[model samples]
Target: GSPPEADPRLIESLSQMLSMGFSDEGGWLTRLLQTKNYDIGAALDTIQYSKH
Candidate 1:
């Protein structure tokens, strides 16, 4: 096996989302990551997910 999927970059992106007032409480980040190809910038393009 290799390193875990919980990369530092992913954590950083999660922080950015929090600052933007988005809630990831439901653990939907995993789904969002796949939907956005795991790119924060691309994810920002759409605000369809939950937000604080």
Candidate 2:
């Protein structure tokens, strides 16, 4: 049987969001590189998004 659902996809969704930042305000490269520093952290930390 399939397990109950959770925020795995939700995580990546925000992960992709962080992949692109504002013009001069920020950059995808920065967020993208930082993501790998803790891709999980990208979604889990510093993100305005959320889950349980």
Candidate 3:
């Protein structure tokens, strides 16, 4: 899927939360950092499974 966009302010707010490690441990962001053979679809799959 194409990237989703909110207002620049919203993006900045989310980025700040991410940088502050809001989802750093046991989270999508963490999985993202650890993912290998990087395929966008596989990332989506990982996120989907890990969500619950």
The TM-score that candidate 2 achieves is 0.20
For model 1, how does the per-residue alpha-carbon lDDT over 1-52 read when each residue is reduced to its tens digit?
Answer: 2123545546566556656776454665666756765556645545454353
- Stretch of 10 with least lDDT, candidate 3: 1-10
Task: Flag the better candidate by lDDT, 1 or 2.
Answer: 1
Looking at model 1, residue 31 earns an lDDT score of: 64
* TM-score, every prediction: 0.41, 0.20, 0.26
lDDT by residue for model 2 (1-52), tens: 2122333432354435444551212445345434554244444333443353
Query: By lDDT, who's the top model here?
Result: 1
Clashes of each: 1, 0, 0
Candidate 2 — which residues are off by over 4 angstroms?
1-7, 22-52
Model-by-model lDDT, in order?
Answer: 0.56, 0.40, 0.40
How well does candidate 2 score on lDDT at residue 31? Answer: 56
Better-scoring candidate (TM-score), 2 or 3: 3
Off by over 4 Å in 3: 1-3, 24-52
Query: Comparing candidate 1 with candidate 3, which one achieves the higher TM-score?
Result: 1
